[PDB]
Design a protein around this ligand. Sequence first.
Ligand SMILES: [Zn+2]
Ligand SMILES: [Zn+2]
Lengths: 200, 214, 168, 233, 112, 213
Amino acid sequence: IALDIEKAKVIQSSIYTTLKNVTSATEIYYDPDPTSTVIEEDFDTVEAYFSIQSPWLLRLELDRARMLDKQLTMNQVADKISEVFSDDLFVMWSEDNADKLIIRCRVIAEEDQMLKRIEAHMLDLIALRPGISKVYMVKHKVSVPDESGEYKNEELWALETDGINLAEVMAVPGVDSSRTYSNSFVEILSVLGIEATRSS
Amino acid sequence: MEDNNRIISRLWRSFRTVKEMAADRGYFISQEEMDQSLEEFRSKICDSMGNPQRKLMSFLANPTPEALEKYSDLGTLWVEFCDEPSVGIKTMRNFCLRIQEKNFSTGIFIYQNNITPSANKMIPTVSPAIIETFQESDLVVNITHHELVPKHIRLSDGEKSQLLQRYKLKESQLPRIQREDPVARYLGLKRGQVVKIIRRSETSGRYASYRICL
Amino acid sequence: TMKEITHAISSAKEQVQEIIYKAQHNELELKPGMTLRESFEGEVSRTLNDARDSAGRSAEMNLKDLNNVKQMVSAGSKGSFINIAQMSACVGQQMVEGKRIAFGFADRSLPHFTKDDFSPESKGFVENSYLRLTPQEFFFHAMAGREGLIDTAVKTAETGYIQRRLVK
Amino acid sequence: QESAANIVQVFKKAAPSPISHVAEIRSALEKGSRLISTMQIKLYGREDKGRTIKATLPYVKQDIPIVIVFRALGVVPDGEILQHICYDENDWQMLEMLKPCIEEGFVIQDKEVALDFIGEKRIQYAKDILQKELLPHITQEEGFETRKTFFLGYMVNRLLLCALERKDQDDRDHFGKKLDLAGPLLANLFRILFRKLTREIYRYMQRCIELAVKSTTITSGLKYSLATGNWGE
Amino acid sequence: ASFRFCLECNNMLYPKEDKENQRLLYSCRNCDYTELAEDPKVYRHELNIGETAGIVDDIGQDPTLPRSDKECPECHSRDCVFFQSQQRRKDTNMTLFYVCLNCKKTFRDESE
Amino acid sequence: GLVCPAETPEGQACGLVKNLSLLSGISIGSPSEPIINFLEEWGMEPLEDYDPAQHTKSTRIFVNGVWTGIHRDPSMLVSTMRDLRRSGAISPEVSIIRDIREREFKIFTDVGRVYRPLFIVEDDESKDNELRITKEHIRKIVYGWSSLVTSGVIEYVDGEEEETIMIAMTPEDLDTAKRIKPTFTHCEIHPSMILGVAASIIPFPDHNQSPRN
Ligand SMILES: [Zn+2]
Ligand SMILES: [Zn+2]
């Protein structure tokens, strides 16, 4: 896979998007009835989630245009959230069709203090899709051996990062751990042996 | 398929790597024994559903017909894996002992996530023999394979005691290489051993450098 | 030719007024990795630059095989295209820290300007040629050169240190 | 000789720092001694962690959480404190910010304790650093506590006005906010002199168990400076 | 949000739960005062308010502002002044907000 | 306007040494009270007794960096002080800045504020749309610069006050040869005044590479 446009992306998104970057706002309402809300634009979202806790609520209003950029899914988003905390935090969510994306949830001695520390732990210690932010794609000039002998123009996509971790972004299915390269020579030496280090 | 389908694909590449290192170290191994496709691998070290059982992967290997020619006493090696994603000081004695008796000289445990501080504090406790520790997630890709990584090579205390006479060197005057160096480990060096590096050069074609291991 | 150029700046001016209208309407998408604002600049810059680039090129081919300045450039004994350009056509865009003349005055270049003027005549684009600058152009230009003089008076001895080290 | 004084400035402080933003104001009596002690109205808690507001006072070892600075001033109830900082009950954001802060000082409920936590012997000193050190311009008189309070309020305001992206970080090089010409120089210089003459004339008066003024310290002193280029004595 | 204080000793209001009856209360920890919940909303974070930044009628006397000859969506005049959001965010957008010398409206140029 | 853009030493200290334009001058140091008073008696309800909610959008006023109370409708407080300076009853050296966009009033007496002079525009033409100064004042030049100021025809604008004014370049205006040229409160005495002693002797400094000048 060299000039595989979509193959490029397929790796990009496999190498940093956080809940914090898709959330337009978050509020914590008082809803003591785990079978209906004190909120209108939420009703449906309850009933349609009982077929195929604490009275304290926490709602998140994610961005639409922001879910198309870094590309995301309520199913995923939450899926992640849920498995982050697990069996001590029941969470729900609407479906990509709606005109307002939302995520409700509750815990499981002073709860207004806890359900607020879990406010952050949600916006800054939870990833969706480390040290590797922005990741652009590029079409480079790579001279190469035509079968017929002569060298010829065979550009191939490449992913450039905006951060540096190697030991890890190396063993990823779809890369060539024989050509990867960070300008951080410090690293290269630590991973590939002083020699390769020198080379850098 | 879930996300466990990949925790296999890796344990496999990590495997082949081990092999390569073992043959490069100076042992027997067929190119095939390295080229065991992912397919014909699954059904060989798996149980029921589709999980791999490592306790059955570990193996031995020995000094090639050749290796005995430059290096006489180079003993036999033993590579081991473990299903305990946190192996400790107890499941240790099983390794520390298994060789101190069989009498090999080269131990190679492949800890998945990490060994206990109580554990490994029992390595240099069985000389002459020596033992090494390699993290899993660090052998997924053979590092030697890299573009920038030039070919290294060991040197009999003969080929060494030669370089020194041939260049009039006082050992210290020779470019060094770290004991905890990625490549140094890969070929399993020791404090006092030399290594000839041979890489491509846009000036002569090939240059021949040497690094002693401090 | 001095005319053919003028209108290569006018048209270039509108290809800016145009993308400014189309920005003051949110009618443009964010090129992945860049801010909606940043991406606005990225074009204005690439617009004025390409404008300026041919502005000069019109004169370059307009100077016969007798033009002395040309001669002193072909011989390779002094100056280049750029030079002719800034002297017979358009001086260019001024700049500091990489971005066209800032807003030192809340939302404006000089007090002689209307707030929020993101145009080129405000951000430091000297449309004039040395042969012909307007105060604004003349100023920005200075702020631009000023950055230049700066490092020629800084990189001068820090470069010498880095040198010294390599030696010792 | 070219940063002007008695003015409010707000600076953002780098990602690596326990402080988010901070506002300062360099103060000095335009005429009379002229102290060079500045006010720091910090804002801990980076743009994330679960965000207090503390300020620095002259001679105080550590820093104090704004609430106390108010009660210690003459404002003891909440909301009467938010009274000074925020000027629009319908600006929940800002107010929100303040919330966590109020909790900080919730433990000190009056002017007694207020001036205390600042360490009978200790309480008295507390006052001092407020009538002669705290935002010393405005006036160091006495019955104006109120005024300084509205400032420290206008300040804590300016802080937030930025930490909420409504006002940029203060332009450090906006020439308008920066020149001590000749005339002024002689001033700060003369004082340094006449003052040594002042306490000189104090010694002749402290020996007479019953003329003296060496008018050479103001003549020769002046010359030295002006001659070389070394102001200070 | 628009939270509340309390009569008696003008202070901050902390919330507590009406266990046995299931409903929200607000209170004080200086005295005893206690009032029911005004709204089920308690806290908001919001990761678009402040773009209209203080626009006193006198905003037609700040000469340093630009002049556009459009016509508000109501009074149909032709003397408007404008700018961009005052939200100093490197990621903001560039839409124009207009004020009219004949009303004090807030019409934009936006179209999405 | 205040400092010359070109004249400044190369290498070493460069930009740490500035020279004044021709028109620039420095403030000297006026008195505050004759203006503190002049205020709390023209709409300035003292800070001492303030109420944030009864007085919402209360434009707060500062004096030399001190907060001397707010004021209700200021639009006038403003165009009164400004009329006071132009007759010459509050030193032409003082600075007054109104920042509507924030609701505040800046008062500066300070000593060390660089300021330049400008023509006043004021749409004061019940005969059109104009510089208070006319060709009758000119040819009239017992008529010093002290009178050009005692008649509100020119103002001393420090850098701060500058922020809230709109300056017109060429008084007049505001051929295939000349350089292409692209609310006003003041006009520029002359652009060639932004230069200081040094450049003033340089011919056509507007035709050379700035770093050379
Ligand atoms: Zn109460
Ligand atoms: Zn209208």
